[PDB]
């Protein structure tokens, strides 16, 4: 009896539900259909107007992402990052790879047990928003983060 | 105390553990009896109730089993139950040292083809035996409040031990008849595929029989003369195909 | 192969007095041999500070064999000889019949000889006449000695004599 | 305490899985069948990457593995 | 084939006592032993605390043979070698007669004797002499104990001595 | 090969009175013979002033054999053959016993005698009788010896006697 | 007395034993990224023999008994088929037994029998420390040495110093009676073991820049 776990280390599913509610009502949008779960951030409240720098107070947001993905038992992880037109095609590429990059690599710096993650970013080429009012504030410029869930 | 050994034998080198050893000592002889029995009570009532449960849910199902377990469809026109086919995929076989033998796949005669009288069911495959026991024999008793709650506890573990046996029980009847219905349909298959010899039966037929007190009007004796293999010449196979 | 004088557990399920001799049997209920019973009688100590118990008959079933190996019980938790009954049982009983058959004696002979210096008379009768052969009779049964009992639900350890196969 | 707690409670045990169901339909992180995938990393036991304690008794304290190797640790110390 | 030492039950319908020996019946009817019908006698003890059944004669339906499993009764619900019956048979019997007898003796002499310090004289005469004969024929019959009888509608059950075939 | 008589640490596990013979072991804990045990018995002194333990019987174990190389015992740290336990069991029972019925005798033939020159002819009663039955039985009784009891957790030490292979 | 001395050599040992198993837990991808076994092993799937090289040999039996070369080689174990690469969980996990049975015979009674079951628990404890840390050191160089055979036998193969395996697989069709059939058989057998040459002319020098 003793020698096998009554559950998975660290995993508490009141624990899951009490920081998943705490997440929405910030405004931090997570998805859940079936084992697939996505994680939808604005980007406003993580970098600078048009740039890859990050503010001090987002490591605490990032810190409480990797509590979330500790909970989990995951294999694969897939980062994408999406923002507006600004300039050009290859400058808003080249800010979401760059944006999607430090943003793995500082989640693979805390402890997720993942195998494989992936990364990557276009930029204003597939919307979720027509209304193109604000531009940085605008909620279309966003960072995305799914998965499924493994038994 | 074992673990922080250094404190533990520190305290055991006090005489007052010394004298709690005694207390415990009477539990170390005395309340090791009655587990094994609590134990095997316990197992006898959860094999006993699982099985009782397991048997009336079969029952309840019993619609889609003989639905999906149509051996009638398999009889063959000869009523001749079809033989068991096994085959293996990736054959190494590593016998020793300095030797290999590999090849891609195998094929097994399991169970030889043969003339049947009645289609065969799943009740004989599948059923659980159980009669109810109604004598629970008791050679020990406990007496303080503990050893009853532990005796309790080693009863639900045998309870639980019951329950796990009988699922393994019918796992390994689910396996098996899986196993010859899909040798069965794999004999099918490869007889259509022209892999297995069609089974050859004679028939020898008289007429009037018999004395002018015992007589038979009609006399056929039906013989197999080849029972099914499978073919050497590989050449006249016939490969499929989809669109 | 069992070594010469090691302890070994088993639990006594039949009481009986140590009065009759007769065939008792208990189990072996750990280590190798599980489940074997033992067939024996018992032994009666001169005196009343222990009790013991002499168990030869040793039957493994499984395989058809009737071993004989003689071993005695140690009281577990004492590491002693003691039996778990009670020793005074008819201690009191011959003593208090002894001292009211002597005070009848002694009510007779000195409540007559007081009468130089009808009931009381009839006292004097009934305690003189019925002290005597009271006090004989109890001086043939005083002798009586004290059993000792054993319980049907205590267990018991054993220790080794000789070696078996 | 409860597996499914904070929800609805929980169901029943699917054994494909090896995993409780909540009222809700989340997986618990309460394991219920033993064959399931635990996260196995550090165990007891001697004799191991070898052939087994060899049950045989012997004079000495020294456990031989079924491999003919000899561990000297879960042997006693002199 | 029976193993040595195991347990059967039995049935007991012929009462019989303690006093004069001879056959008594008995009949399996559990276990493999189905029809089985047993004769055997009874043995005395020392104290009347217990009693036992010397059974040996042990006939098996069916064929035309008679095994002779010697065996011993044990009490079913009490797995003790105690014995349905009353154990205070001849105690306050023999008490009273011995002390009527005395008080008889004491009351002649005494009434006799305390005259210096007709009717009441022949209560004198009756207890003075039919005191004596009575005292010695009490200490005559004093040495019987209380006999036993088993019943003739209890069970019984029986553990084994030695093996058969 | 064990010199001519050395000595040898032990610890002994099973305690007993001097009241009935039975089987004792002990267990060397040091040395070069590691885990080997010894049983034996005892034998009863003429007086009570020291116990010694008959330590024939030697086991040690791991192969099937058992050596009888005899030896006794000496009290650890004290270098003598005393035994720790108690020689006054039986001393001022039957002391007072006697003492008591001798009393009793004395006081109801005195005060008998003291009529000369109702309760307290009572006192004269009870006493004068109850004396004399008792003052035999405690004469009789008076032979029982202050037995002593080794303890289950003393070490003990073991001088050899001749030599082994 | 000494059963202190016991039972402080089985807490320490049990007790190191139960750290340095965590610690070689905590340890655990770069032990592998190490001792990869996979990246040596040959074309098929043979287990690559082990190599033993020695430097400057002297030696002396007696007065007027010397010999004395520069280096000599050694084939330890003979290369052979393998199914799974070893790693290194069969040369450094050391076993862990707990034992939860301090029985006491000896019993203290006085603080200085206190103080030296103490002092004997703390030297018995630091005693049992260390022969751990000795098995350990052992297992490690075992597996050093396996591993730098390995690498000789590389090194000396690709120095032209031993001859290679050679192999042959042996075709057939299919194989058995009408009842049991196989596919395509193979048989693969190794002719000739690995073995130095003695003939040193064939041997290709190197030089670096």
Redesign the interface.
Known sequence: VP???????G????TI??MMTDLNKKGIKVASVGQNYLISIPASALFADQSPRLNWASYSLLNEIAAFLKQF?KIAITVTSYSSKYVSVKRERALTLARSRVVSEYLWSQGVDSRIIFTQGLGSDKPITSYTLGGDRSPNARVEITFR?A? | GDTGSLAGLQAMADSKYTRAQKKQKMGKIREMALKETALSVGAQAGLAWRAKIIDEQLNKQARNLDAIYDFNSLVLEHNILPPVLLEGRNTLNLADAQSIRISDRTYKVAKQAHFITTPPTWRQYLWMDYVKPEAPNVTLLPKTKAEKEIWCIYTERGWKNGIDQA?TILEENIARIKEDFGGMILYRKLLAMNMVSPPYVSHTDLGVTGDGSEIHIDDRVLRITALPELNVNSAEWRAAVAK | ?IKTGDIMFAVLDTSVNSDEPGPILATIVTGKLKGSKLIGSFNLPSNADKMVITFNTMSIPGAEKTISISAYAIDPNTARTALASRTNHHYLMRYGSLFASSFLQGFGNAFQSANTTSTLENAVIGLATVGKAWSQQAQQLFNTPTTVEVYSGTGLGILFTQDVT | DG?????GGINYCD?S?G?LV?NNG??????CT?HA???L?????????HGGVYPQ????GLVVCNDGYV????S??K
Do not use: H
């Open positions: 020698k096998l776990p009554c559950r998975v280390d995993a508490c599913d009141a539900i009490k038992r869930r038994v | 699922n | 192969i | 597996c499914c707690s904070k929800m054994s899985a995993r909540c989340f997986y618990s992180t309460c394991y033993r995938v635990m996260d990393q550090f165990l007891m036991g001697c004799c191991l990457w008794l012997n004079s000495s561990s000297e640790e879960c006693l110390q």
